[PDB]
Design a protein around this ligand. Sequence first.
Ligand SMILES: Nc1nc2c(ncn2[C@@H]2O[C@H](COP(=O)(O)OP(=O)(O)NP(=O)(O)O)[C@@H](O)[C@H]2O)c(=O)[nH]1
Ligand SMILES: [Mg+2]
Lengths: 94, 419, 75, 136
Amino acid sequence: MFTINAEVRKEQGKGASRRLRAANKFPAIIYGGKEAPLAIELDHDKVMNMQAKAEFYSEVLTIVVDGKEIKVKAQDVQRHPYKPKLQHIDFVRA
Amino acid sequence: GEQAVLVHIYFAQDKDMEDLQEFESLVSSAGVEALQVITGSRKAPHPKYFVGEGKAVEIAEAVKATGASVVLFDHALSPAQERNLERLCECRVIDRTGLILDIFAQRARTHEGKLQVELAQLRHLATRLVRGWTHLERQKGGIGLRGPGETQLETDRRLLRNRIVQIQSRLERVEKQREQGRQSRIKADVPTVSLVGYTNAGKSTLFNRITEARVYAADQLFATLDPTLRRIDVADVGETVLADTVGFIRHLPHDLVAAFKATLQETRQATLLLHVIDAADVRVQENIEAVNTVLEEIDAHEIPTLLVMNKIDMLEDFEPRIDRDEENKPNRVWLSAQTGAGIPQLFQALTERLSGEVAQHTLRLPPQEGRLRSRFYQLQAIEKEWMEEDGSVSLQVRMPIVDWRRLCKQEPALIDYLI
Amino acid sequence: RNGRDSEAKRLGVKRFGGESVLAGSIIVRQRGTKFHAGANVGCGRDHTLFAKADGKVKFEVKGPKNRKFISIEAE
Amino acid sequence: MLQPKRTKFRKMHKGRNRGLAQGTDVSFGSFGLKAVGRGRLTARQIEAARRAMTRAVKRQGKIWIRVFPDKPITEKPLAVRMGKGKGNVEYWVALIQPGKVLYEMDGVPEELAREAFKLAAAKLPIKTTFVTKTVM
RNA sequence: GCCUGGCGGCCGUAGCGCGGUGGUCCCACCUGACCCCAUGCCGAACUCAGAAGUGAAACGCCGUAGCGCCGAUGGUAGUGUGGGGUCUCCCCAUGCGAGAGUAGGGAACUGCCAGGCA
RNA sequence: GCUCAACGGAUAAAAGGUACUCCGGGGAUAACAGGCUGAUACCGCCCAAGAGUUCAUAUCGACGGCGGUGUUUGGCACCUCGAUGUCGGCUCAUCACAUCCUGGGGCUGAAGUAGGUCCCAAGGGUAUGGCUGUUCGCCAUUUAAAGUGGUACGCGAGCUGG
RNA sequence: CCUCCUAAAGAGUAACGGAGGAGCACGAAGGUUGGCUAAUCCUGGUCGGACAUCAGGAGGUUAGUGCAAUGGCAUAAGCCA
RNA sequence: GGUUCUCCCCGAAAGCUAUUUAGGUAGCGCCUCGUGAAUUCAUCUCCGGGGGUAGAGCACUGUUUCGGCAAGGGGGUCACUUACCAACCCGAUGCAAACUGCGAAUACCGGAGAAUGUUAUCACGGGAGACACACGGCGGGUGCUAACGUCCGUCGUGAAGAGGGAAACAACCCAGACCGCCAGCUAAGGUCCCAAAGUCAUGGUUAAGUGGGAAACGAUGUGGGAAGGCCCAGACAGCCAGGAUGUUGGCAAGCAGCCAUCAUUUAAAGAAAGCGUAAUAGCUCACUGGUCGAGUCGGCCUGCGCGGAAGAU
Ligand SMILES: Nc1nc2c(ncn2[C@@H]2O[C@H](COP(=O)(O)OP(=O)(O)NP(=O)(O)O)[C@@H](O)[C@H]2O)c(=O)[nH]1
Ligand SMILES: [Mg+2]
């Protein structure tokens, strides 16, 4: 049911990630299987309200990147130490 | 809560002797672990150590052998005697008054109790300013030369006196607060009874049983600090205030008694004192003497008193009863705490104790006496209730004269039975 | 009670990987054999490692225990 | 009042309290009190907050204390000069960084948990926030 | 080509466990002990003269992710230089960028010599 | 042949008092007062277990928390050692307000008189003696009140010298 | 005088900073040749107890080092002749 | 303490070691003049190295919390057992300057290569001065992550450095004065007047003179963002109506306290929210509907504001 819409990261690193989080996106990674890992950026408020639901961390999610639907599972979440925010999500293909 | 060598001396010649068992009780209540209890006998105190040179060397040897941390005398000893004992044995020395002040310091949980205990400690320490060891040495000078202008001993005396005055001033503030709390009741025609006596007299548990209100009680000496007041029912005058109080011990420090002036205001102005006495204590006469001595010290011995002998259950084959003076006024009562024996007789004696009316009226009216129900049941009660022929209702009532007068003013008073 | 210390011993690697050494030059001063000796390197009585031949210093890790060895490669 | 039973040494250096907290998730119970600020938490403060919240929940549920004060803090007495050796140990503190979950709580409704944690946070010297258990 | 022995390279992706398998040669145990040699007692070990037996144990090989081991990408922490703040601590630009953890890998690879069987 | 151990070791061989004091220096360095700080002190607030005849917040307020002043004790050694006279008293004062009295007001466990507490308010007022060198303090007797602090702990080129 | 830390990953680095030691010992406790491998626990066993020696097992240095601490030590630098 | 004419070039240190030494002095470090010897030296790139710091982690050394599987002791039976306690091990969770199965950035050592630099490197000789340092930044010990405090490391400035800025203000920011000019461009910092330059352009916020001093904490101030409940089955605050049966539940009536805390007819009612009553009666909250026709309710994240906020000419 969960359909996230994400872009492919032009630049990756500390500075780029913090610029994303100041612009209210945040980075994430898709790995697993045998295709190469894909580094993407997501919309923070949308994914936060999405992961408020408990079944987010159990169902098969879909992510739309460059018009391609990739089916994934949420593997790890990195959260801000004291704010209700997200730093990074790891998605495993399945 | 450290290791101590305990010291007691049998001053049998004069009344300056103290009880070793009570002393050990105070020490254990303080929490100190006793490694040895030394005894001596003397005629009058030795000025240099408070004990002989031989006994001082024995206490030094005992400290050296046992590795003790403190030495607890059961007696008041001067700062010079403390200094000389300290010089002989490196361990610290605690007076009986110091032990009592330490016990109260540990026990104090309220703001008032902390204030009083720190005032007592400040006065006790102001007594012990004999050594002015400081690193600034004597300030030399002459006429027209710079300097502090005064000695360090005088400066320290100034500072101690100033801070003592500060603690005192906050204490009269606390007295004003408690006096407002008192004055809430005095404008009312309040009866107030304060139960007081030697420690471990069972008076706190007597309060708990009478008032059905939980207050701390145990086998710990000086268990209670600060008073607690509770409403109680008495047959004659109705509502009365029972007050628990901090207990006494033989030879309370005078600085402590002065510090507790704010707390003792309840006993000062009590309409009755219930002097609760442990009958099972073999030193019962000494307890009477000590309690009367402190009452005289605070100048509260002219108040009406009534003795209450608790712990009759420890007396074999005894039943409670009330001993009465030649004027037919109950001056002594006996009772028990846990078994509850003697409690109703204590209530009856309390009814008899304070009152100024014995007349009983009988009232009756046509159907206009629901207001009479309300007013009677409002002031006190209906003493004897019944009806009679033709719908008439014949009450019998006995309430105080002030209640009579206020009821007469409020009502039309066409009953022509109540004044 | 705690105003004491010993003169510092100036221990450590005195001559680093790849530098040229004459015979007899101390490579590393050490308490215990933190570096062991390999080719053309001698161990002293206080565990000093010195060059036994003119060459260039080389560091390596050898053996089952992954121990560090000092060797001198003849230039 | 918490304290280590024993220690290798009696006096630690002052150090610094930089960085972000580890152990930033509610692990044992369902609810937790998390530190938003930074600073020390003394054993007296920890005891005060624990007593307040345990009174707020009248002997019900279960309470975990995640922070333990294991750092000795020395203070020199008054009328003493500088130097002449390091001061004597007077109390123990727990260094708190942002994100550190301090207390944890289970077996209670969320309203009672919030009330108890307000009463506790009224005793601590650092800003805190309410947190709830999360999956992954 | 297959198997064994000796000596190396590398030093856990190489180990420890579990299951199976091998005696032609080799190896192992094994047979005996005046002597060569030895037990702070013991032919257990060291050692000598051998070859009836069995691969039981050991050893080698093969299979198994039980444990060990290895281990990205992305993010995070930290930090050099320059600048800023609300300056006990942080943030911005730029360069370097962990540890832990996840996905996954992993039942080593190889050189000289000798013997047996093809 | 060295506890030359004060361990780069004055000599083989060596302790104290000075208020009867002296001389060269140093504000490189203490005491006074000033400065920085503000642990301590004083005041203020946050939470509310509890006390308060029932009743957390009339009046208080434990366990703990946060500030303010610069005011006590301290910390530092910044100024002054080619001199910045110290405590108390007398004379003369001046500001602050965290108000002692008098004014205005909210609450009150304010029936009335009399109070308590908080808020506004600095115009004016704001003891005399015994004891002691005293400041303080105790006491006697007063008053509407006998405020708390700053001013080199105001004030010796104004007095005194306990 | 020696060990560690402060000490900021070469050296070095102060305070009346935090903690401990030395002012020796040994003709074997030195040299060399040959040989060997610990602590602890589990189980069974005469006197035997939680802990004396023996037998096997797990374990792999949690032992040892003449004396503090640090760093080392299985080729052993540990033990025996 | 004082030490007398001029100009030109270079130009410190306030550290280590030792000392009856500590405000003295000596060697070295630093200055300077001279002589001599090589890419000698610095910077950057690449290459070869060793770290054990920051961070991290918890195998080790210690410390810590909870749970699990459970020896062993002890209050009692006079070997059972256990509301106390409970080591080992297992799982999760943290902490360490004197912990490390990990581990940077920098710095340091060495080699090679350009370019650049008044040889800036090394040695020797003549002459010194100096060995009270101060503050600022970063990393620390100590102190209270107190001090214009003290003690180290490292860089900068002052010392020994003028000019511009910070009102004034050695050590902070910009910036290194050979001399003259009534010429121009910029740095920090500024551009309404004192006072040189925008009463400049565009879009927002604030109403507090906030700006131009301050905290926990308190608050329908005001702007913005993402969701949520409800509403044309009519919502929210407004406007009418009912709160009773056992029962005065029991140990005082719902309303001192304590225990049951469940039904009920029913549109609905907690054995009752405070007031109040001696206490009932009473008061009416929770509790439910009618009428009323466009939005309403309250949590989260954030910009800027408010109170908390009292000193002496
Ligand atoms: N045997 C017996 N023990 C009694 C009796 N009354 C009281 N006690 C016990 O004596 C002790 C009394 O303590 P407490 O009630 O605090 O009396 P208290 O005098 O008010 N204590 P304090 O004055 O020191 O604060 C308790 O141990 C109580 O058990 C009695 O009648 N008989
Ligand atoms: Mg009592």
